[PDB]
Amino acid sequence: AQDSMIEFKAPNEKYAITVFTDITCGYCVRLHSQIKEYNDLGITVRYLAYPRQGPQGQVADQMAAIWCSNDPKAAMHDAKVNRKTITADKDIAQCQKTIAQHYMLGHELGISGTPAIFLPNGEMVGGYLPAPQLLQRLQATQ
Ligand SMILES: [Cl-]
Numbered sequence: 335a336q337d338s339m340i341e342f343k344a345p346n347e348k349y350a351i352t353v354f355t356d357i358t359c360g361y362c363v364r365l366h367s368q369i370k371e372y373n374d375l376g377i378t379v380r381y382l383a384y385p386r387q388g389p390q391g392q393v394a395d396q397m398a399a400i401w402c403s404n405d406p407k408a409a410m411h412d413a414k415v416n417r418k419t420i421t422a423d424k425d426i427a428q429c430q431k432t433i434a435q436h437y438m439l440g441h442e443l444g445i446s447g448t449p450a451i452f453l454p455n456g457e458m459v460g461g462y463l464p465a466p467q468l469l470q471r472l473q474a475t476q
């Protein structure tokens with residue numbers, strides 16, 4: 335559950351967000367291209383998979399290969415910012431279960447689009463926000 339996330343830990347973290355993402359979403363790519371901006375403002379980003387196709391389509395298999403790569407952080411970047419095909423380095427059957435569990439969690443929480451950003455207090459941002467505006471949203475809520 336809370337142990338199958340891909341975490342971009344921010345030095346001197348002041349806030350931590352949970353992001354349901356989809357590698358095919360143009361704004362999830364925009365969000366991932368700004369991870370350094372998030373960390374520089376003290377925002378830790380933790381990724382959860384949510385293929386809008388569904389937990390068994392071709393997007394879920396690509397995100398399963400990301401979670402099953404020897405370096406999932408580099409696999410996420412090559413898939414989002416570079417549109418490169420990711421091949422699983424470990425048994426993809428392990429990660430296909432994780433992707434399906436991540437989708438079931440996002441469906442349980444009731445998200446309706448990606449990226450789904452959850453704040454520490456539980457509130458949700460309905461899409462991508464740059465690091466400055468996201469920091470302002472966190473300071474106003476947390
Ligand atoms: Cl990690």
Ligand SMILES: [Cl-]
Pocket residue numbers: 387388389390391
């Ligand atoms: Cl599906």
Ligand SMILES: [Cl-]
Pocket residue numbers: none
């Ligand atoms: Cl289980």
